[PDB]
């Protein structure tokens, strides 16, 4: 590939809300901010965004080259603004609790489509990973958060810099798995097998919150997905397994890209969301029962974010469903990419 044209000017120290930070990042690369991220990962209704805090604010700069096959067009650099060092105080998120470290998976999954080119996926991954990583603890019904090399002290009153965790090196990534499908226990078993890991006796495992014998149709809705594993040895402060996902479509199995048709439950198509809420409520409660430190909670939660997340339209007597980053089209006949996930040229 050709080398980048290098650097446009550094931004000011950047901050939230997400739409505003995305706008400044996009302008920094010399591009219009065409996505509307409002409502995708905002704070719960009624909560003001606090001022720059936690070593979480940062400057950004960008460089550009032509978008060629195999040559991602953009390249970024991040410099943390450590002047804004007071600990962040944030509300608990519905179902996720102090989930600020892994909510970004919703946006990363925009580039997990079967038709996302590998070089595109890797280019956006580099961007996402450069954002300062959040480390949160819960104190008296609120979240106390610091980013990057800083973590909350035990009392959640200050951001401190622990000794470097010096995590062991990852081994080679696996290949993609085959397309995985429900029931959930089969998905879980396949992850253990594909990633060559164990159910730690103290560990967490999601259990089906589905009724006794609900009908599971053939793979559909871009809901079936492949996984790719990167694994490192255990070490305190270091979660050992990182998972990537890639949805399956019509070139992966013949029904995989067709909309899902399900029966209604209790006269509605809400049951997928209800089940998702239950799984997260149970995980969040388990993370506290088992006294999980933030790095371990976050590691499990990032994997749990990879489960299929459905949106359904009720059409006649049936539910027509697709999984993120897809949603049903207007008449419930096909699956389409959510607008804020579309590639820039598809917008
Ligand atoms: C952006 O999305 C939010 C929520 O979906 C909506 O309330 C808002 O009006 C949208 N803005 C534009 C300019 O489309
Ligand atoms: C259906 O309704 C019953 C009682 O109203 C409730 O217990 C159940 O969780 C609902 N959904 C399913 C899938 O059973
Ligand atoms: Ca393929």
Residue numbers in the entry: 22 to 368
Would you copy out the relevant sentences from the publication that reported this structure?
Here we characterize the structure and function of p43, the single most abundant protein in secretions from adult T. muris, whipworm. Structural determination by X-ray crystallography reveals potential interaction with glycosaminoglycans and the host cytokine IL-13. Binding studies confirm high-affinity binding to heparan sulfate (HS) and IL-13. Moreover, p43 inhibits IL-13 immune function both in vitro and in vivo.
Trichuris muris p43 comprises 397 amino acids (AA), 36 cysteine residues (9%), and a histidine-rich C-terminal region (45% of terminal 29 residues are His). Analyses of the primary sequence reveal an internal repeat with residues 1–180 and 181–394 sharing 34% amino acid sequence identity. The protein has mixed α and β composition with 16 β-strands and 6 α-helices. The crystal structure reveals contiguous electron density for residues 21–368, and no electron density is observed for the histidine-rich C-terminal region. The structure shows that all 36 of the available cysteine residues are involved in the formation of 18 intramolecular disulfide bonds. In each of the two domain repeats, eight disulfides are conserved, while the bond between C274 and C277 has no equivalent in domain 1 and C131 from domain 1 bonds to C362 of domain 2. The disulfide bonding pattern is unevenly distributed throughout the protein clustering around the β-sandwich region (β4–β8). There are three potential N-glycosylation sites predicted at positions 57, 174, and 287, and the crystal structure shows clear evidence of glycosylation at residues 57 and 287, but not at position 174. Surface representation of p43 by electrostatic surface potential indicates a negatively charged region, suggestive of a possible binding cleft between the two domain repeats. Native mass spectrometry and collision-induced dissociation (CID) experiments showed p43-bound IL-13 with a 1:1 stoichiometry and confirmed that p43 was a flexible molecule with the potential for conformational change upon activation.
